[PDB]
Design a protein around this motif. Structure first.
Motif, PDB file in Angstrom:
ATOM      1  N   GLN A 119     -19.424  -0.305   7.789  1.00  0.00           N
ATOM      2  CA  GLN A 119     -19.332  -0.121   6.346  1.00  0.00           C
ATOM      3  C   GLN A 119     -18.638   1.199   6.014  1.00  0.00           C
ATOM      4  OE1 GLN A 119     -23.063  -0.020   4.092  1.00  0.00           O
ATOM      5  NE2 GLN A 119     -22.011  -0.672   2.217  1.00  0.00           N
ATOM      6  N   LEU A 120     -19.112   2.268   6.643  1.00  0.00           N
ATOM      7  CA  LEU A 120     -18.572   3.613   6.486  1.00  0.00           C
ATOM      8  C   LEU A 120     -17.080   3.690   6.845  1.00  0.00           C
ATOM      9  CD1 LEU A 120     -19.804   6.218   5.504  1.00  0.00           C
ATOM     10  CD2 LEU A 120     -20.715   6.595   7.797  1.00  0.00           C
ATOM     11  N   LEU A 121     -16.720   3.206   8.033  1.00  0.00           N
ATOM     12  CA  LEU A 121     -15.328   3.220   8.483  1.00  0.00           C
ATOM     13  C   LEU A 121     -14.410   2.451   7.545  1.00  0.00           C
ATOM     14  CD1 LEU A 121     -15.933   2.546  12.274  1.00  0.00           C
ATOM     15  CD2 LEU A 121     -14.852   4.644  11.423  1.00  0.00           C
ATOM     16  N   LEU A 122     -14.849   1.270   7.105  1.00  0.00           N
ATOM     17  CA  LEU A 122     -14.058   0.430   6.193  1.00  0.00           C
ATOM     18  C   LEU A 122     -13.927   1.020   4.793  1.00  0.00           C
ATOM     19  CD1 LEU A 122     -15.044  -3.228   7.177  1.00  0.00           C
ATOM     20  CD2 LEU A 122     -12.845  -2.099   7.565  1.00  0.00           C
ATOM     21  N   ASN A 123     -14.979   1.696   4.331  1.00  0.00           N
ATOM     22  CA  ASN A 123     -14.934   2.430   3.064  1.00  0.00           C
ATOM     23  C   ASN A 123     -13.982   3.631   3.078  1.00  0.00           C
ATOM     24  OD1 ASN A 123     -16.718   1.034   1.100  1.00  0.00           O
ATOM     25  ND2 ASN A 123     -18.321   1.462   2.605  1.00  0.00           N
ATOM     26  N   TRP A 124     -13.921   4.356   4.187  1.00  0.00           N
ATOM     27  CA  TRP A 124     -12.931   5.428   4.329  1.00  0.00           C
ATOM     28  C   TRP A 124     -11.494   4.925   4.269  1.00  0.00           C
ATOM     29  CZ3 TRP A 124     -15.761   7.856   9.142  1.00  0.00           C
ATOM     30  CH2 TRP A 124     -16.891   8.564   8.691  1.00  0.00           C
ATOM     31  N   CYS A 125     -11.257   3.738   4.815  1.00  0.00           N
ATOM     32  CA  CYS A 125      -9.932   3.135   4.777  1.00  0.00           C
ATOM     33  C   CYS A 125      -9.502   2.871   3.343  1.00  0.00           C
ATOM     34  CB  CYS A 125      -9.905   1.834   5.571  1.00  0.00           C
ATOM     35  SG  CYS A 125     -10.113   2.054   7.346  1.00  0.00           S
ATOM     36  N   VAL A 126     -10.471   2.558   2.483  1.00  0.00           N
ATOM     37  CA  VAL A 126     -10.230   2.265   1.071  1.00  0.00           C
ATOM     38  C   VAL A 126      -9.932   3.547   0.299  1.00  0.00           C
ATOM     39  CG1 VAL A 126     -11.267   1.397  -1.067  1.00  0.00           C
ATOM     40  CG2 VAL A 126     -11.673   0.189   1.076  1.00  0.00           C
ATOM     41  N   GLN A 127     -10.764   4.554   0.528  1.00  0.00           N
ATOM     42  CA  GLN A 127     -10.667   5.836  -0.153  1.00  0.00           C
ATOM     43  C   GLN A 127      -9.367   6.562   0.166  1.00  0.00           C
ATOM     44  OE1 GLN A 127     -14.272   7.957   0.657  1.00  0.00           O
ATOM     45  NE2 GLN A 127     -15.575   6.258   0.000  1.00  0.00           N
ATOM     46  N   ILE A 128      -9.017   6.628   1.450  1.00  0.00           N
ATOM     47  CA  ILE A 128      -7.711   7.139   1.866  1.00  0.00           C
ATOM     48  C   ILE A 128      -6.573   6.387   1.161  1.00  0.00           C
ATOM     49  CG2 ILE A 128      -6.121   7.557   3.825  1.00  0.00           C
ATOM     50  CD1 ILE A 128      -8.685   7.897   5.590  1.00  0.00           C
ATOM     51  N   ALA A 129      -6.593   5.052   1.222  1.00  0.00           N
ATOM     52  CA  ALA A 129      -5.527   4.246   0.622  1.00  0.00           C
ATOM     53  C   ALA A 129      -5.424   4.450  -0.891  1.00  0.00           C
ATOM     54  CB  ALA A 129      -5.700   2.787   0.962  1.00  0.00           C
ATOM     55  N   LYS A 130      -6.569   4.459  -1.571  1.00  0.00           N
ATOM     56  CA  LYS A 130      -6.658   4.827  -2.988  1.00  0.00           C
ATOM     57  C   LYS A 130      -6.015   6.176  -3.338  1.00  0.00           C
ATOM     58  CE  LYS A 130     -10.575   2.124  -4.601  1.00  0.00           C
ATOM     59  NZ  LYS A 130     -12.008   2.176  -5.001  1.00  0.00           N
ATOM     60  N   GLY A 131      -6.361   7.235  -2.612  1.00  0.00           N
ATOM     61  CA  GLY A 131      -5.734   8.547  -2.830  1.00  0.00           C
ATOM     62  C   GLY A 131      -4.221   8.522  -2.654  1.00  0.00           C
ATOM     63  N   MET A 132      -3.757   7.749  -1.677  1.00  0.00           N
ATOM     64  CA  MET A 132      -2.332   7.583  -1.405  1.00  0.00           C
ATOM     65  C   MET A 132      -1.652   6.782  -2.522  1.00  0.00           C
ATOM     66  SD  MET A 132      -1.607   9.363   1.141  1.00  0.00           S
ATOM     67  CE  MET A 132       0.070   8.793   1.347  1.00  0.00           C
ATOM     68  N   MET A 133      -2.339   5.728  -2.967  1.00  0.00           N
ATOM     69  CA  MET A 133      -1.980   4.957  -4.145  1.00  0.00           C
ATOM     70  C   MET A 133      -1.712   5.885  -5.328  1.00  0.00           C
ATOM     71  SD  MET A 133      -4.236   1.603  -5.309  1.00  0.00           S
ATOM     72  CE  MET A 133      -4.675   1.660  -3.597  1.00  0.00           C
ATOM     73  N   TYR A 134      -2.606   6.856  -5.528  1.00  0.00           N
ATOM     74  CA  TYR A 134      -2.507   7.817  -6.624  1.00  0.00           C
ATOM     75  C   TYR A 134      -1.313   8.754  -6.441  1.00  0.00           C
ATOM     76  CZ  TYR A 134      -4.016  11.548  -9.907  1.00  0.00           C
ATOM     77  OH  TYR A 134      -4.087  12.481 -10.911  1.00  0.00           O
ATOM     78  N   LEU A 135      -1.083   9.184  -5.201  1.00  0.00           N
ATOM     79  CA  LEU A 135       0.105   9.971  -4.868  1.00  0.00           C
ATOM     80  C   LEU A 135       1.391   9.206  -5.166  1.00  0.00           C
ATOM     81  CD1 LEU A 135      -0.601  11.861  -1.475  1.00  0.00           C
ATOM     82  CD2 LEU A 135      -0.850  12.749  -3.802  1.00  0.00           C
ATOM     83  N   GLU A 136       1.478   7.967  -4.676  1.00  0.00           N
ATOM     84  CA  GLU A 136       2.657   7.116  -4.872  1.00  0.00           C
ATOM     85  C   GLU A 136       2.989   6.875  -6.346  1.00  0.00           C
ATOM     86  OE1 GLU A 136       4.456   2.659  -4.121  1.00  0.00           O
ATOM     87  OE2 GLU A 136       2.722   3.290  -2.904  1.00  0.00           O
ATOM     88  N   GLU A 137       1.939   6.673  -7.142  1.00  0.00           N
ATOM     89  CA  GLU A 137       2.023   6.495  -8.581  1.00  0.00           C
ATOM     90  C   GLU A 137       2.772   7.671  -9.204  1.00  0.00           C
ATOM     91  OE1 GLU A 137      -1.859   5.386 -10.196  1.00  0.00           O
ATOM     92  OE2 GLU A 137      -1.159   5.446 -12.277  1.00  0.00           O
ATOM     93  N   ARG A 138       2.602   8.859  -8.614  1.00  0.00           N
ATOM     94  CA  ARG A 138       3.237  10.100  -9.097  1.00  0.00           C
ATOM     95  C   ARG A 138       4.573  10.381  -8.388  1.00  0.00           C
ATOM     96  NH1 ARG A 138      -1.194   8.879 -10.562  1.00  0.00           N
ATOM     97  NH2 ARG A 138      -2.428   9.941 -12.166  1.00  0.00           N
ATOM     98  N   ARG A 139       5.031   9.422  -7.576  1.00  0.00           N
ATOM     99  CA  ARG A 139       6.250   9.538  -6.744  1.00  0.00           C
ATOM    100  C   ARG A 139       6.177  10.661  -5.707  1.00  0.00           C
ATOM    101  NH1 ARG A 139      11.320   7.589 -10.750  1.00  0.00           N
ATOM    102  NH2 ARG A 139       9.943   6.160 -11.925  1.00  0.00           N
TER     103      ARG A 139
END
Ligand SMILES: CCc1cc2ncnc(Nc3ccc(OCc4cccc(F)c4)c(Cl)c3)c2s1
Length: 292
Positions: A119-139
């Protein structure tokens, strides 16, 4: 005269950046050091205040570009990305950010190996990807995504750090000179090995390598294989192995991040959503013993 008005509905950036006096900061010890600079554990006592705020201070070994990058770093407002608290200009420019008490993820996974679940490992994969999503949104391209650049606020909450610094120190020159790059080859997308072709899709490659580090509980990518040989191996189709705990479901997500064609890779939006649904049924996707 008066300047011709042309509004664009973009909201004002009311991020605060604090310029800090040299003396508001004290260094306790060193946390790490490398190509990026030295990171100190420290204490910030704001001007006139009493509270001793736990901080990390980064010193680097042009200044228009720095103050421009510092604006980006302070503007980041997302649970899974760090935010720059302050800048100290003296004696050389120092970066000040809130200290993460549980430290770096790469160290955390290895130390807490025997007690990290699916659960923990899979949740970190989401959180990392989300933060990157936010970075990409800002180019914004990270350029140096790695488990080592993910910090643990609390076990169930990680943040990405060190975005922007790579471009600030290296630049955007397509051709590498004899000095090469500052980022580790083994996290780098193939196209960025040959020239500086840094994009959101290159970060995705690095995301793949980062999540492999986690599934191997701090494993070292292409362990032992010298960095000179990597570009040849990758072009011959060599990729990271399937981590024992990984179902083919999770491994294929990883493998798709390492497609030759950068456009063929998953977008961060897809990565967060897939690991999200995996995190709803985490034992169907990661097989760790004791994980009941
Ligand atoms: C391993 C144990 C650690 C705990 C911890 N807690 C907070 N920050 C840490 N490191 C750190 C990394 C980069 C830093 O400045 C660069 C930067 C880049 C982008 C946004 C920022 F706020 C900043 C700064 Cl200032 C700090 C670290 S390292």
């Amino acid at each position: 005269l008066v300047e011709p008005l042309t509004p664009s509905g973009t909201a004002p950036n009311q991020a605060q950046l604090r310029i800090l006096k040299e003396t508001e900061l004290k260094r306790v010890k060193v946390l790490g050091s490398g190509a990026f600079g030295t990171v100190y554990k420290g204490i910030w006592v704001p001007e006139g205040e009493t509270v001793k705020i736990p901080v990390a201070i980064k010193i680097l070994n042009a200044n228009v570009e720095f103050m421009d990058e510092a604006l980006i770093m302070a503007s980041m407002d997302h649970p899974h990305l760090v935010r720059l608290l302050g800048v100290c200009l003296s004696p050389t420019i120092q970066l000040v950010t809130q200290l993460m008490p549980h430290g770096c993820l790469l160290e955390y996974v290895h130390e807490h190996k025997d007690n990290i679940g699916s659960q923990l490992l899979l949740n970190w994969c989401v959180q990392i990807a989300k933060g990157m999503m936010y970075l990409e949104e800002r180019r914004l391209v990270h350029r140096d995504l790695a488990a080592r650049n993910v910090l643990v606020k609390s076990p169930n909450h990680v943040k990405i750090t060190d975005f922007g610094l790579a471009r600030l120190l290296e630049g955007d020159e397509k051709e590498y000179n004899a000095d090469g790059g500052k980022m580790p080859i083994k996290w780098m997308a193939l196209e960025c090995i040959h020239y500086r072709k840094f994009t959101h899709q290159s970060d995705v490659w690095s995301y793949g390598v980062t999540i492999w580090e986690l599934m191997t509980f701090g494993g070292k990518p292409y362990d032992g294989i010298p960095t000179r040989e990597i570009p040849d191996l990758l072009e011959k189709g060599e990729r990271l192995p399937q981590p024992p705990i990984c179902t083919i479901d999770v491994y294929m997500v990883m493998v798709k991040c390492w497609m030759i064609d950068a456009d063929s890779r998953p977008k961060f939006k897809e990565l967060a959503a897939e690991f999200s649904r995996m995190a709803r049924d985490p034992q169907r996707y990661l097989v760790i013993q004791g994980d009941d």
